[PDB]
């Protein structure tokens, strides 16, 4: 029921744990992607019913399985020789619990993501920080003695 554009947008904002000093920029065009300048994840979730279900049948956690697509169902697919440049567990989405879609039995999601390298000025899904800011340091001073009550 989540649309395709909204699903692509929600997958656009999930942060990736890959170090961006090792990759390079994808050139203008170059729609395939090579070993140097991209990654590739694969989400595939099929939602069915539960073969054992109680007579009350109230909560969706008992009646169904894989009805909440989290970001832990993202599975990395290497390209070229990237299987040795990164050990098993350093290329993954970060927060392990981000809800993407939500399913009902008979509905299926399969897709193929292509991570690349980009600056934050282009789009706000490349910003490395939640928020970065500063303030000056205060110096409250007491001009006269404040005593008692």
């Amino acid at each position: 029921i989540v649309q395709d554009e909204i699903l692509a947008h929600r997958l656009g904002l999930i942060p990736i744990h890959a170090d961006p000093r090792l990759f390079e920029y994808r050139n203008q065009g170059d729609e395939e992607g090579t070993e140097i300048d991209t990654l590739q994840f694969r989400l595939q979730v099929r939602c069915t019913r539960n073969p054992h279900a109680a007579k009350d049948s109230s909560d969706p956690n008992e009646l169904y399985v894989n009805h909440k697509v989290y970001t832990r169902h993202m599975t990395w697919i290497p390209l070229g020789n990237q299987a040795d440049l990164f050990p098993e567990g350093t290329i993954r989405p970060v927060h392990d619990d981000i809800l993407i879609a939500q399913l009902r039995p008979g509905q299926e999601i399969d897709l193929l993501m292509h991570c690349v390298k980009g600056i934050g000025k282009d789009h706000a899904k490349f910003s490395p920080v939640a928020t970065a800011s500063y303030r000056l340091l205060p110096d409250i001073t007491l001009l006269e003695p404040v005593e008692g009550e």
């Binding site: 395709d4 554009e5 692509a8 947008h9 997958l11 656009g12 008979g106 993501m113 789009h123 899904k125």
Partner: protein, 46 residues
């Protein structure tokens, strides 16, 4: 190879081929929805 349509109420495959009045084979519901395409489509994550 045949055109399989999805029924609206009972969600079952029907395969309407001959020139017939449109009706589900299993229920009496008379509205079909086409299935999704099998060709891939590309979206930008913006």
């Amino acid at each position: 190879q045949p055109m399989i349509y999805i029924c609206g109420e009972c969600h079952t495959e029907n395969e309407i081929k001959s020139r017939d009045p449109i009706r589900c084979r299993e229920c009496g519901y008379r509205i079909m929805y086409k299935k999704r395409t099998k060709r891939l489509v590309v979206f930008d994550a913006r």
